[PDB]
Amino acid sequence: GFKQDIATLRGDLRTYAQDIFLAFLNKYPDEKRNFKNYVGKSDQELKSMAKFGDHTEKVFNLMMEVADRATDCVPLASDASTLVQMKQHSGLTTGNFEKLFVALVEYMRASGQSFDSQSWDRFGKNLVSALSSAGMK
């Protein structure tokens, strides 16, 4: 289930982080508005950019911590405030995060692994709600 999935993802986190974020950007190409330097690149070209791998992994490092500190897929309010108040999220709305978790959930469903996709779907919905409660438009 959810906790085991965190362990699974952490066991190959650079690969999963890049592949899930690539699934996100390909499913929602307009989201490149927030990542202008990734425009005009293929998946393999992004995986060769040190910035891409570093940033992707740091994002998922934090995402797994938030997931890990959650109870029953409900994130801590403190984690939600951190996500809303970090300056790199200045322009973001909850729809950006929703789309990321849609892509994540569809990635797990398309995988042949026993991911608990329904728990990640709930986690995403509860994080979006916590973000709104913490002040994200």
Ligand X SMILES: Cc1cc([N+](=O)[O-])ccc1O
Task: Give dist(CA 99, CA 35) in Å, integer.
Answer: 15
Query: Which residue among 6, 35, 65, 76 contacts ligand X (CB under 6 A)?
Result: 35
Structure tokens at 103: 């892509």
Please name the amino acid found at residue 110: A
8 Å CB contact between 133 and 94: no
* Binding flag, residue 59, ligand X (CB under 6 A): yes
- The piece of 8-16, 48-56, 106-114, 127-135 that touches ligand X (CB under 6 A) is 48-56
- The piece of 2-10, 54-62, 74-82, 118-126 that touches ligand X (CB under 6 A) is 54-62
- Please tell me what DSSP assigns to residue 43: H
Q: Which does 43 bind (CB under 5 to 8 A by kind): ligand HEM, ligand X, none?
A: none
Task: Give dist(CA 124, CA 130) in Å, integer.
Answer: 10
* Binding flag, residue 49, ligand X (CB under 6 A): no
Query: Which residue among 49, 62, 102, 134 contacts ligand HEM (CB under 6 A)?
Result: 62
- Please tell me what DSSP assigns to residue 11: T
CB-based contacts of 16: which residues, under 8 Å, 6+ apart? Answer: 9, 60
Q: Which does 119 bind (CB under 5 to 8 A by kind): ligand HEM, ligand X, none?
A: none
Provide the binding-site residues for ligand X, judged by CB under 6 A: 17, 21, 35, 52, 55-56, 59-60
